Enzyme design. Structure first.
Site, PDB file in Angstrom:
ATOM      1  CG  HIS A  61      -1.766  -1.191   1.335  1.00 12.68           C
ATOM      2  ND1 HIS A  61      -2.717  -1.515   0.396  1.00 12.68           N
ATOM      3  CD2 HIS A  61      -1.803  -2.179   2.250  1.00 12.68           C
ATOM      4  CE1 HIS A  61      -3.299  -2.654   0.735  1.00 12.68           C
ATOM      5  NE2 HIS A  61      -2.761  -3.086   1.863  1.00 12.68           N
ATOM      6  CG  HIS A  91       2.543   5.815   6.004  1.00 15.93           C
ATOM      7  ND1 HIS A  91       2.257   5.712   7.346  1.00 15.93           N
ATOM      8  CD2 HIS A  91       1.447   6.366   5.417  1.00 15.93           C
ATOM      9  CE1 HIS A  91       1.041   6.171   7.544  1.00 15.93           C
ATOM     10  NE2 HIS A  91       0.513   6.585   6.391  1.00 15.93           N
ATOM     11  CG  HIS A  93      -0.962   8.429   1.965  1.00 13.52           C
ATOM     12  ND1 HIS A  93      -1.655   7.256   1.943  1.00 13.52           N
ATOM     13  CD2 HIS A  93      -0.725   8.677   3.276  1.00 13.52           C
ATOM     14  CE1 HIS A  93      -1.851   6.819   3.196  1.00 13.52           C
ATOM     15  NE2 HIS A  93      -1.276   7.673   4.028  1.00 13.52           N
ATOM     16  CD  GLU A 103      -4.228   9.500   2.698  1.00 16.48           C
ATOM     17  OE1 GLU A 103      -4.022   9.490   3.924  1.00 16.48           O
ATOM     18  OE2 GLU A 103      -4.714   8.555   2.019  1.00 16.48           O
ATOM     19  CG  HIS A 116       0.003  10.286   7.068  1.00 10.92           C
ATOM     20  ND1 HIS A 116      -0.964   9.643   6.381  1.00 10.92           N
ATOM     21  CD2 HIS A 116      -0.240  11.619   6.916  1.00 10.92           C
ATOM     22  CE1 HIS A 116      -1.793  10.481   5.822  1.00 10.92           C
ATOM     23  NE2 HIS A 116      -1.387  11.724   6.131  1.00 10.92           N
ATOM     24  CB  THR A 195      -6.263   8.038   5.536  1.00 13.54           C
ATOM     25  OG1 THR A 195      -4.920   7.525   5.361  1.00 13.54           O
ATOM     26  CG2 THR A 195      -6.215   9.321   6.340  1.00 13.54           C
ATOM     27  CB  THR A 196      -5.445   2.586   4.927  1.00 12.21           C
ATOM     28  OG1 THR A 196      -4.813   2.210   6.177  1.00 12.21           O
ATOM     29  CG2 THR A 196      -4.463   3.475   4.205  1.00 12.21           C
TER      30      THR A 196
HETATM   31  C1  LIG Z   1       3.726  -0.219   8.669  1.00  9.91           C
HETATM   32  C2  LIG Z   1       2.342  -0.110   9.256  1.00  9.91           C
HETATM   33  C3  LIG Z   1       1.303   0.328   8.466  1.00  9.91           C
HETATM   34  C4  LIG Z   1       0.034   0.428   8.984  1.00  9.91           C
HETATM   35  C5  LIG Z   1      -0.222   0.040  10.290  1.00  9.91           C
HETATM   36  C6  LIG Z   1      -1.596   0.134  10.770  1.00  9.91           C
HETATM   37  C7  LIG Z   1      -2.230  -0.911  11.437  1.00  9.91           C
HETATM   38  C8  LIG Z   1      -3.520  -0.444  11.668  1.00  9.91           C
HETATM   39  C9  LIG Z   1      -4.613  -1.130  12.412  1.00  9.91           C
HETATM   40  F1  LIG Z   1      -5.583  -0.322  12.825  1.00  9.91           F
HETATM   41  F2  LIG Z   1      -5.141  -2.151  11.787  1.00  9.91           F
HETATM   42  F3  LIG Z   1      -4.130  -1.615  13.549  1.00  9.91           F
HETATM   43  N1  LIG Z   1      -3.706   0.755  11.149  1.00  9.91           N
HETATM   44  N2  LIG Z   1      -2.541   1.101  10.569  1.00  9.91           N
HETATM   45  C10 LIG Z   1      -2.525   2.428   9.969  1.00  9.91           C
HETATM   46  C11 LIG Z   1      -1.662   3.353  10.491  1.00  9.91           C
HETATM   47  C12 LIG Z   1      -1.700   4.651  10.002  1.00  9.91           C
HETATM   48  C13 LIG Z   1      -2.588   4.980   9.005  1.00  9.91           C
HETATM   49  S1  LIG Z   1      -2.731   6.670   8.441  1.00  9.91           S
HETATM   50  N3  LIG Z   1      -2.661   6.667   6.853  1.00  9.91           N
HETATM   51  O1  LIG Z   1      -4.036   7.098   8.881  1.00  9.91           O
HETATM   52  O2  LIG Z   1      -1.639   7.390   8.957  1.00  9.91           O
HETATM   53  C14 LIG Z   1      -3.456   4.054   8.463  1.00  9.91           C
HETATM   54  C15 LIG Z   1      -3.417   2.748   8.964  1.00  9.91           C
HETATM   55  C16 LIG Z   1       0.828  -0.378  11.080  1.00  9.91           C
HETATM   56  C17 LIG Z   1       2.106  -0.423  10.590  1.00  9.91           C
HETATM   57 ZN   LIG Z   2      -1.155   7.616   6.014  1.00  7.48          ZN
END
Ligand SMILES: Cc1ccc(-c2cc(C(F)(F)F)nn2-c2ccc(S(N)(=O)=O)cc2)cc1
Ligand SMILES: [Zn+2]
Length: 256
Positions: A61, A91, A93, A103, A116, A195-196
């Site tokens: 992603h 990370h 976007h 976003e 983010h 946001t995902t």
């Molecule tokens: C490398 C990595 C990537 C994602 C996650 C994670 C896990 C989860 C959850 F909720 F399932 F636990 N969300 N979630 C996550 C974290 C931040 C965002 S954001 N774009 O809003 O910053 C969106 C989703 C953890 C580690």
């Molecule tokens: Zn993000």
């Protein structure tokens, strides 16, 4: 199998994740004339000097730089926040073209990308618990525009060739996230969500007003990543952003 494509992208997420149509979804458009300055806000405290990065991962992603969050090393405090929030990962976007990719939007303006920096409230002991709480996360969002290079981003760019495809990771130690921050910490803040998927409504958003500049070359290297797995048909990792969601019953506050 959520993603950003025509058949699995943001408009489809609500089927597996009905909170997608929730009351405090992110991102949002930041209407700068309607945001209210809040003298209540105390200065934001970004204390990243002891950050310890571990790895970088292509998760299908985006790419994610993961930190050791087992002690109070890199933390965010102040601002709208109560207590201490620990950096767990950052990370980005980004877009297929410089005119889209962020976003959040500012008066409907889209930036080329958005950083983010994800933090969790230490009152909940771990990230997984924190995401189940309305004040569990603080995400510091920083816009990227294309212009001059950001020297502090270059170490990230140069490792991307080693994590081209979904599921690849690499050692990524001694990266200093202070090199990703703009001069000003002037921000907008509002209550929102991931946001995902799973789109959990657990985030205090802090979006900085001042973008960082990155070069065309730097963002071009983001766009050479792949959403697919190794030995699968190539799908460039581009336009991995969710569009602005309804603001509903929220006010965006400004620190300035
Ligand atoms: C490398 C990595 C990537 C994602 C996650 C994670 C896990 C989860 C959850 F909720 F399932 F636990 N969300 N979630 C996550 C974290 C931040 C965002 S954001 N774009 O809003 O910053 C969106 C989703 C953890 C580690
Ligand atoms: Zn993000």
């Amino acid at each position: 199998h959520w993603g950003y494509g025509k058949h699995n992208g943001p408009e489809h997420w609500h089927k597996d994740f009905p909170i997608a149509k929730g009351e405090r979804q992110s991102p949002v458009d930041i209407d700068t004339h309607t945001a209210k300055y809040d003298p209540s806000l105390k200065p934001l405290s970004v204390s990243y000097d002891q950050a310890t990065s571990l790895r970088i991962l292509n998760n299908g992603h985006a790419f994610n730089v993961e930190f050791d969050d087992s002690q109070d090393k890199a933390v965010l405090k102040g601002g709208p926040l109560d207590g201490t929030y620990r950096l767990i990962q950052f990370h980005f976007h980004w877009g297929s073209l410089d005119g889209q990719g962020s976003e959040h939007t500012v008066d409907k303006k889209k930036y080329a990308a958005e950083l983010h920096l994800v933090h969790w409230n230490t009152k909940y002991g771990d990230f997984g618990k924190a995401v189940q709480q309305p004040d569990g996360l603080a995400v510091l969002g920083i816009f990227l525009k294309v212009g001059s290079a950001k020297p502090g981003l270059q170490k990230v760019v140069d490792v991307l060739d080693s994590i081209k495809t979904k599921g690849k990771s690499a050692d990524f130690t001694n990266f200093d996230p202070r090199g990703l921050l703009p001069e000003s910490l002037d921000y907008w803040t509002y209550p929102g969500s991931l946001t995902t998927p799973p789109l959990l409504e657990c985030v205090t958003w802090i979006v900085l007003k001042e973008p960082i500049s990155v070069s065309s070359e730097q963002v071009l290297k983001f766009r050479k990543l792949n959403f697919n797995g190794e030995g699968e048909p190539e799908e460039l990792m581009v336009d991995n952003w969710r569009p602005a969601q309804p603001l509903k019953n929220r006010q965006i506050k400004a620190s300035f």
